[PDB]
Design a protein around this ligand. Structure first.
Ligand SMILES: [Zn+2]
Ligand SMILES: [Zn+2]
Lengths: 436, 436
């Protein structure tokens, strides 16, 4: 049984505080580290920030730490809950909170305990975490599916100077035969990308953003896409590597229109595009480049632009700001046929049970699921076991640079090695990895 | 006893392959991950790289992995060595290699096994790794000393565009009272530094180098030092935070002279400085800024410039490229009075025993020891327990950004919490933390 629950403050990949939870059982101490999330959030679970400008720039998690230590811990020990019954753990946490967006205790305090329990349940059951996570989600286990990693290589929009409004350019080595191969291939494209970048834009152009990709001063989408196609080519992996985009269009949505030069800041309003004109630009890009996935193509409440686009897209369309891992939000997206893949961010909903529940509903509607990292990550490898337990066949966990990213990619290499012949690489079937 | 030894290839913070070793005993599986090192090296232990340009850009470690699996493992199991006898483990590894620079098996293959053993010895002894490492080095344990972190915030030289020839600017919160405080303070200076940088040099200026600091296009040392003094000021930590430099002067040493504008590339040769003129520029800097440590002020074989400088420096002088963690090199440095602190890079010598031996000799000569990270780090936290076991009172493990860096800083926070009153923060006595 659980004899102790403790929380301490530690730091995320950006140097901002985050919550670390330690759970003690008769089998040892189990720990989890929460990724940074939102402290203000409609439709999303809110993490709790101290807000004291005189400490950590107002990003402490001292309260959140107190909620775990002074509130949950005492209650949790007394409840004497079976960690194996994940739903029981989560229903307990939720009831303790009593808010819909975990704003009383904080999503950060709750998640930390929710993930540590699953670690402790695995230990107790004597199986690898991915296997316990597969038990919980009632996923097929013969074979297990290793996912295609969607590696961030280049960033624009709010994460770069230059005129480029699209936010993230990813490469996906769908052509590989094992996870180890896709990771090698992906790292070689990445390294060629850096060489080219430093050569065409300067030494500075070689530094990395929060997730590990470059941020040269780029003017257009073609410009960026051309750079990546050169890097794929230069690495000799043409045909084996596809492109993924994250438009994060909520960022340049203004007055019912889309401003492709939003950094302008004298943006010719005559050039803003309507949903349909935007869909024509994506169609163009899609014809010239090997794009297989497009995330957040339209704004988070622009329902009709999604539906319209969806009808003729023909590639995977990922909902991220549109669904913010919110089931009420997912059901609507499903009903409106706005997309066919969900970006899953466990800390956006706050509990393991609700995160598994959100993927199950997506799967039932024929949607694929892309498990995802946060901007402010940690050394914790939880999402690697989660992607395999869920059998989604696709993960977005950054570039092949910075260990908060590589920790997860390194964990996928171990799992693959351990499964032997009981594992298959999703490949070209990343979309529907669950039905493989 | 040791029943198994396995190695697998995994990735470092830069996306380049590295060796991971797993050691099995009756107490479980113990793992270590080696930082990337040198494959070509005079005076240093050489790690082994596959060199096959068609895979990982010729940086595979497949051979190194084979050396562990096919060569050491079989021999190691049969030798039936006590992991508690660290010297016995290391003498065994070394004898198996039979070269002076571990060029037959590779420093990367050997270190991986050398560090995993110490993990397994701790387990067996039932103590925290730092405590086992203190037992091995015959270090004082009452109290334990937590170190002042020398955080990289800004880089120049070969790591940046601009004319600035000095390579690394560090902040050291010697004024803090606990490790947790120094880390908070340090992160707040860092974050202010980023805000200022992005404001004065542009959004791009905000991206990070391999270690987590910024790399704006800076022209002079005063320029950079002025920026940091503003960030300290803006964070409100004036007086509590000091500056550390890493000149990496081997990089602009040419024709017996120092070229401060080596990126020139029309460097006015009339402006190159002799050792003594260079010492006058450092003296200047030292008078205007709160500099408490200077690493590699003169070139790696410029013996007389070191001695001369040393005589009137009055602050800590760190040997890094001068000693390359080589004891023959350290003895000479000691005898010539070229410096009074050693940068310790375990993978530069290849074994735990030799790394402890190199620190012990430094200490005996009255030198301080700065435990250090590599450019290509991992999620492994070994150097955090090492810095505490050695009682050095100072560590250089990057900026408070990128988890290959924060993993170590996060590990120091846990150790501090666990020691309670049995721990002291080195503070202003970082230099001689060992004699505290
Ligand atoms: Zn997104
Ligand atoms: Zn150095």
């Amino acid at each position: 049984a659980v004899s102790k629950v403790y929380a301490r403050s530690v730091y995320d990949s950006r140097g901002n505080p985050t919550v670390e939870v330690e759970l003690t059982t008769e089998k040892g101490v189990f720990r989890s580290i929460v990724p940074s999330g939102a402290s203000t959030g409609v439709h999303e679970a809110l993490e709790m920030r101290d807000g004291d400008k005189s400490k950590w720039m107002g990003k402490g998690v001292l309260h959140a730490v107190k909620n775990v230590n002074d509130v949950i811990a005492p209650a949790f020990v007394k409840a004497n809950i079976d960690v194996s019954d994940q739903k029981a753990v989560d229903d307990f946490l939720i009831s303790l909170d009593g808010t819909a967006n975990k704003s009383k205790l904080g999503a950060n305090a709750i998640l930390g305990v929710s993930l540590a329990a699953s670690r402790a349940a695995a230990a107790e059951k004597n199986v690898p975490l991915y296997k316990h996570l597969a038990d919980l989600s009632k996923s097929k286990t013969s074979p297990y599916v290793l996912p295609v990693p969607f590696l961030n290589v280049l960033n624009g929009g709010s994460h770069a100077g230059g005129a480029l409004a699209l936010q993230e350019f990813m490469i996906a080595p769908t052509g590989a035969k094992t996870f180890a191969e896709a990771l090698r291939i992906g790292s070689e494209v990445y390294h060629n990308l850096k060489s080219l970048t430093k050569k065409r834009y300067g030494a500075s152009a070689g530094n990395v953003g929060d997730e590990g990709g470059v941020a040269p001063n780029i003017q257009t989408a073609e410009e960026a896409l051309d750079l990546i196609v050169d890097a794929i080519k230069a690495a000799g992996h043409d045909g084996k590597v596809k492109i993924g985009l994250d438009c994060a269009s909520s960022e340049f949505f203004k007055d019912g229109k889309y401003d492709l030069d939003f950094k302008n800041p004298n943006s010719d309003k005559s050039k803003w595009l309507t949903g349909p004109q935007l869909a024509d630009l994506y169609h163009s890009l899609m014809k010239r480049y090997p794009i297989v996935s497009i995330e957040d193509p339209f704004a988070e409440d622009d329902w009709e632009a999604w539906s319209h686009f969806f009808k003729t897209a023909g590639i995977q369309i990922v909902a991220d700001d549109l669904t913010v891992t919110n089931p009420k939000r997912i059901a609507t997206a499903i009903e409106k046929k706005a997309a066919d893949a969900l970006l899953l961010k466990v800390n956006q909903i706050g509990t393991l049970s609700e995160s598994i529940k959100a993927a199950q509903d997506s799967f039932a509607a024929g949607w694929g699921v892309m498990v995802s990292h946060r901007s402010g990550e940690t050394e914790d490898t939880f999402i690697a076991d989660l992607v395999v337990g869920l059998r989604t066949g696709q993960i977005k966990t950054g570039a092949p640079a910075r260990s908060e990213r590589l920790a997860k990619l390194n964990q996928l290499l171990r799992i693959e090695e351990e499964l032997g012949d009981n594992a298959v690489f999703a490949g070209e079937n990343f979309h529907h990895g669950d039905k493989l």
